[PDB]
Amino acid sequence: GLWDPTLPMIPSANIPGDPIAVVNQVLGISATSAQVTANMGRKFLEQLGILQPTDTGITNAPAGSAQGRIPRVYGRQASEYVIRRGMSQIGVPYSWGGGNAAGPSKGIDSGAGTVGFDASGLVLYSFAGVGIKLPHYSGSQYNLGRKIPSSQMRRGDVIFYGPNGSQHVTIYLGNGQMLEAPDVGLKVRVAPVRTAGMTPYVVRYIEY
């Protein structure tokens, strides 16, 4: 069928725009995922010794382009940092709609009372570390980056499920394993890759 039958066979949470990611009610500040992501991207480019005054910190390639802000020679480093971030969230609860560029967060609808990640939330949190800004909806993530045939998926690529990649999204780890925020009552986990419902392409956000 069109869907991974192990998960709800509906589109994933679709959270619009640029959500507030950090709130500090004692200091009286707040900032959005795009703000947190830009800050992290500038930090990453500075640690590579390549920050420029024109850099906002957002490092995405134009969708479909093989050329992004992060040089190819540094792409493996960037990818491993993204994976490190994601893997550091192993054991955090799933929450439908949960997560932002700063970490897990309260979800929506069903996940309104649970601080955690959903699938696209975990992916956007992970990639935000190197300035790769992603929308909080798997289907919209699928339209960014560069498509790679799923048969040629590589560690750091992003695997999608459902029509238009609308159901679920995970980070491929290589060796037939993926990092995911799977479903209600579970935790961020490493799991075997599932092919049911998988889109015919994975997405690459970082070239190397």
UniProtKB/Swiss-Prot annotation:
Compartments, record wording: Secreted
Superkingdom as given in the UniProt entry: Bacteria
Ranges of residues in domain NlpC/P60: 76-208
PTMs per UniProt: Exported by the Tat system. The position of the signal peptide cleavage has not been experimentally proven.
Active site, UniProt feature: 119 (nucleophile), 168 (proton acceptor), 180
Its biological purpose: Peptidoglycan endopeptidase that cleaves the bond between D-glutamate and meso-diaminopimelate. Binds and degrades high-molecular weight peptidoglycan from a number of Actinobacteria; activity is increased in the presence of RpfB and inhibited by PBP1A (ponA1). Required for normal separation of daughter cells after cell division and for cell wall integrity. Required for host cell invasion and intracellular survival in host macrophages.
Additional remarks: Was identified as a high-confidence drug target.
Family to which this protein belongs: Belongs to the peptidase C40 family.
Subunit note: Monomer. Interacts with RpfB and PBP1A (ponA1) via residues 448-472 of RipA, interacts with RpfE. Interacts with the chaperone MoxR1. RipA-MoxR1 interaction in the cytoplasm leads to proper folding of RipA, resulting in its secretion. Also interacts with Mce2B.
UniProt name for this protein: Peptidoglycan endopeptidase RipA
Organism: Mycobacterium tuberculosis (strain ATCC 25618 / H37Rv)
Gene this chain is encoded by: ripA
Parent-protein residues present: 265 to 472 of 472
